[PDB]
Short mmCIF file of C-alpha atoms and ligand atoms in Angstrom, two decimals:
data_model
loop_
_atom_site.label_atom_id
_atom_site.label_comp_id
_atom_site.label_asym_id
_atom_site.label_seq_id
_atom_site.Cartn_x
_atom_site.Cartn_y
_atom_site.Cartn_z
CA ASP M 1 51.52 34.18 37.56
CA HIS M 2 54.06 33.62 40.35
CA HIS M 3 54.01 30.35 42.25
CA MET M 4 56.87 28.17 43.33
CA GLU M 5 57.82 26.19 40.23
CA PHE M 6 59.07 23.43 42.50
CA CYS M 7 57.57 21.44 45.36
CA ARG M 8 57.66 22.94 48.86
CA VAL M 9 58.19 19.42 50.29
CA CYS M 10 60.81 17.73 48.07
CA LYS M 11 62.06 20.73 46.03
CA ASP M 12 61.54 19.03 42.65
CA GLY M 13 59.48 20.34 39.76
CA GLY M 14 56.91 18.98 37.34
CA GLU M 15 53.16 18.61 37.81
CA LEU M 16 52.42 20.94 40.73
CA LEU M 17 49.26 21.74 42.67
CA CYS M 18 49.24 25.49 43.28
CA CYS M 19 47.53 27.21 46.19
CA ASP M 20 44.77 29.75 45.57
CA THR M 21 45.85 32.08 48.41
CA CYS M 22 49.65 31.86 48.58
CA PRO M 23 52.64 31.13 46.29
CA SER M 24 53.07 27.58 47.62
CA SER M 25 53.21 24.58 45.30
CA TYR M 26 53.12 20.86 46.08
CA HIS M 27 53.16 17.46 44.45
CA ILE M 28 49.92 15.60 45.07
CA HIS M 29 52.03 12.68 46.31
CA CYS M 30 53.97 14.93 48.74
CA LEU M 31 50.91 16.14 50.65
CA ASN M 32 50.04 14.49 53.97
CA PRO M 33 47.91 12.57 53.21
CA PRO M 34 48.71 12.25 49.48
CA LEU M 35 46.08 13.10 46.89
CA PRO M 36 45.26 10.74 43.98
CA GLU M 37 44.65 13.59 41.52
CA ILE M 38 44.66 17.36 41.30
CA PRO M 39 41.31 18.45 42.78
CA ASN M 40 39.09 20.95 40.97
CA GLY M 41 37.88 24.36 42.04
CA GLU M 42 39.47 25.91 45.12
CA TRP M 43 42.42 24.29 46.88
CA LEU M 44 44.06 25.66 50.02
CA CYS M 45 47.52 24.38 50.91
CA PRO M 46 48.43 22.98 54.35
CA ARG M 47 49.98 26.33 55.25
CA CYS M 48 46.88 28.42 54.56
CA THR M 49 44.71 25.94 56.50
CA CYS M 50 47.20 25.77 59.39
CA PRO M 51 45.59 26.52 62.79
CA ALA M 52 46.90 29.52 64.71
CA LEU M 53 48.98 29.29 67.87
CA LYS M 54 47.21 30.26 71.08
CA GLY M 55 50.08 32.57 72.01
CA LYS M 56 53.75 33.35 71.70
CA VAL M 57 56.04 30.36 72.16
CA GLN M 58 58.66 30.78 74.89
CA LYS M 59 60.35 27.37 74.96
CA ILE M 60 60.17 24.03 73.18
CA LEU M 61 60.22 21.40 75.94
CA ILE M 62 60.02 18.00 74.22
CA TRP M 63 58.75 16.47 71.00
CA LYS M 64 57.21 13.20 69.88
CA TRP M 65 55.98 11.62 66.68
CA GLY M 66 52.25 12.08 66.24
CA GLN M 67 49.83 9.73 64.54
CA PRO M 68 49.53 9.75 60.74
CA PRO M 69 46.28 11.19 59.39
CA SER M 70 43.51 9.11 57.91
CA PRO M 71 44.51 7.87 54.43
CA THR M 72 43.07 9.53 51.35
CA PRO M 73 40.53 7.17 49.73
CA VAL M 74 40.85 6.50 46.00
CA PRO M 75 37.69 6.17 43.87
CA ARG M 76 37.27 2.91 42.01
CA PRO M 77 38.19 3.49 38.34
CA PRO M 78 34.97 3.71 36.33
CA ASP M 79 35.65 0.63 34.16
CA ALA M 80 36.48 -1.71 37.05
CA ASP M 81 35.59 -5.37 37.44
CA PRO M 82 33.19 -5.95 40.37
CA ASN M 83 35.63 -8.57 41.71
CA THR M 84 38.56 -6.14 41.61
CA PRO M 85 39.29 -4.72 45.09
CA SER M 86 39.02 -0.97 45.43
CA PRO M 87 42.41 0.77 45.19
CA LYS M 88 44.41 0.81 48.41
CA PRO M 89 43.85 4.15 50.21
CA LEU M 90 46.75 6.58 50.01
CA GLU M 91 48.78 6.31 53.20
CA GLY M 92 49.86 9.34 55.22
CA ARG M 93 52.84 9.68 57.53
CA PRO M 94 53.62 10.91 61.05
CA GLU M 95 54.36 14.56 61.78
CA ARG M 96 56.45 15.83 64.69
CA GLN M 97 54.54 17.13 67.71
CA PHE M 98 56.06 19.69 70.08
CA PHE M 99 55.17 20.36 73.71
CA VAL M 100 55.72 24.07 74.35
CA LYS M 101 55.87 26.60 77.16
CA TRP M 102 53.88 29.74 76.38
CA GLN M 103 55.08 33.28 77.00
CA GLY M 104 53.19 34.80 79.92
CA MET M 105 51.55 31.47 80.85
CA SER M 106 52.55 28.98 83.52
CA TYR M 107 53.57 25.37 82.94
CA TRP M 108 49.91 24.53 83.60
CA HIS M 109 49.13 25.80 80.08
CA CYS M 110 51.77 23.80 78.23
CA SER M 111 50.24 22.32 75.11
CA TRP M 112 51.09 20.57 71.87
CA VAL M 113 51.74 22.17 68.49
CA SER M 114 52.67 20.66 65.15
CA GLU M 115 55.92 21.03 63.24
CA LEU M 116 53.97 22.90 60.55
CA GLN M 117 52.94 25.44 63.20
CA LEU M 118 56.45 26.08 64.51
CA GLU M 119 57.74 26.22 60.92
CA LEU M 120 55.19 28.95 60.13
CA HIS M 121 55.07 30.98 63.33
CA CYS M 122 58.25 30.27 65.32
CA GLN M 123 60.77 29.40 62.61
CA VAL M 124 63.77 31.08 64.25
CA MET M 125 63.19 29.28 67.56
CA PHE M 126 62.39 26.05 65.76
CA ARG M 127 65.44 26.08 63.51
CA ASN M 128 67.54 26.70 66.64
CA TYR M 129 65.90 23.72 68.35
CA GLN M 130 66.57 21.42 65.38
CA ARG M 131 70.25 22.38 65.48
CA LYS M 132 70.62 21.29 69.14
CA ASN M 133 68.54 18.09 69.05
CA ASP M 134 68.45 14.72 67.31
CA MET M 135 65.23 15.03 65.33
CA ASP M 136 64.92 11.37 64.30
CA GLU M 137 64.16 9.72 67.67
CA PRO M 138 62.37 11.65 70.44
CA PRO M 139 64.17 12.00 73.77
CA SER M 140 62.84 10.06 76.76
CA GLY M 141 62.80 12.59 79.60
CA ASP M 142 48.53 8.26 94.41
CA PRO M 143 46.04 8.94 91.60
CA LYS M 144 46.85 12.63 91.17
CA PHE M 145 50.59 12.05 90.74
CA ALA M 146 49.92 9.61 87.90
CA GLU M 147 47.71 12.22 86.23
CA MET M 148 50.36 14.94 86.64
CA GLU M 149 53.22 12.63 85.62
CA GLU M 150 51.19 11.52 82.59
CA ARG M 151 50.32 15.03 81.40
CA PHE M 152 53.18 17.31 82.56
CA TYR M 153 56.19 15.77 84.30
CA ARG M 154 57.14 13.06 81.79
CA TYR M 155 57.52 15.85 79.20
CA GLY M 156 60.30 17.63 81.09
CA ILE M 157 58.50 19.67 83.76
CA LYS M 158 59.61 19.76 87.38
CA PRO M 159 56.58 19.42 89.71
CA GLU M 160 57.80 22.48 91.63
CA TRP M 161 57.30 24.70 88.57
CA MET M 162 53.56 24.05 89.02
CA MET M 163 53.43 24.67 92.79
CA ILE M 164 52.69 28.06 94.31
CA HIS M 165 55.48 29.86 96.12
CA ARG M 166 53.71 33.19 96.67
CA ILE M 167 50.65 35.08 95.48
CA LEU M 168 51.74 38.59 94.55
CA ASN M 169 48.63 40.51 93.45
CA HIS M 170 45.04 40.08 92.29
CA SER M 171 42.75 41.38 89.56
CA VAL M 172 39.02 41.22 88.77
CA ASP M 173 37.57 40.63 85.30
CA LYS M 174 34.90 42.65 83.58
CA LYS M 175 32.78 39.58 84.43
CA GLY M 176 33.81 39.61 88.10
CA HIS M 177 36.16 36.61 88.04
CA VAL M 178 39.14 37.06 90.36
CA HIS M 179 42.63 36.44 88.97
CA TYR M 180 45.82 35.98 90.99
CA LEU M 181 49.42 36.76 90.08
CA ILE M 182 51.37 33.65 91.09
CA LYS M 183 55.07 33.31 91.82
CA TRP M 184 55.94 29.69 91.07
CA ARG M 185 58.33 27.60 93.13
CA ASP M 186 61.80 27.08 91.65
CA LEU M 187 61.24 29.89 89.09
CA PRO M 188 62.33 33.56 89.16
CA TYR M 189 59.81 36.36 89.57
CA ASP M 190 59.83 37.22 85.87
CA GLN M 191 58.15 33.81 85.39
CA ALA M 192 55.22 34.77 87.62
CA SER M 193 51.94 34.66 85.76
CA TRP M 194 48.28 35.50 86.17
CA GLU M 195 46.15 32.47 86.91
CA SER M 196 42.41 32.04 87.25
CA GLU M 197 40.72 31.75 90.63
CA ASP M 198 39.22 28.46 89.44
CA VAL M 199 42.37 26.56 88.42
CA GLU M 200 42.94 23.47 90.58
CA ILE M 201 46.35 24.33 92.00
CA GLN M 202 47.52 22.37 95.03
CA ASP M 203 46.85 24.35 98.23
CA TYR M 204 45.34 27.17 96.12
CA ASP M 205 42.89 28.10 98.88
CA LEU M 206 45.66 28.23 101.47
CA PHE M 207 47.72 30.73 99.44
CA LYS M 208 44.62 32.80 98.67
CA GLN M 209 43.81 33.39 102.34
CA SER M 210 47.50 33.97 103.05
CA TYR M 211 47.47 36.69 100.37
CA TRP M 212 44.45 38.39 101.94
CA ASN M 213 45.97 38.17 105.41
CA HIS M 214 48.89 40.10 103.91
CA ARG M 215 46.40 42.81 102.92
CA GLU M 216 44.73 42.54 106.35
ZN1 ZN P 1 57.29 16.97 46.16
ZN1 ZN P 2 48.59 28.41 50.66
#
């Protein structure tokens, strides 16, 4: 009935693989990784199989090129010579990866999402980010420090944004786990966020007892 008559990747027409649960259409050679032939039965396009975000995106911090997926293997043609090598597997390509700050979550919960995810679920924010950033080459900007530098700081996070300034309130789960509302250093109060009792925040215990002394 109604599918794109034109590839969602390159915007050309011709032999198109059409999704079974959305209007999208693709060339088999434009998928990542490419396909050697139109499969049979059900096919779900990369957009319908796209994982869901764990929350609302507040800010795109940095991006990097991710690793290409495993190539698509090509069956040997049925009339092949035993000495003929099997066809080269169909090579994929890198996709952009984005390190994001989540709405209502502290910089402890920053995590990576794909370009396909932002394109689907945060397209306004993402199209704004593309406009302000060179998207061809990513920007470049004590055991525990090396672990924090490696995971958070190198990606554009001030250490202070992950240090406690004040604990403002508490809450108890249905399961009895205590949760604390944390004001973070170098960030306004509207960036305070609920954090688990069990997160390994520097001096966590010292701010907990300071909070309860305030209740006295
Ligand atoms: Zn195409
Ligand atoms: Zn689809």
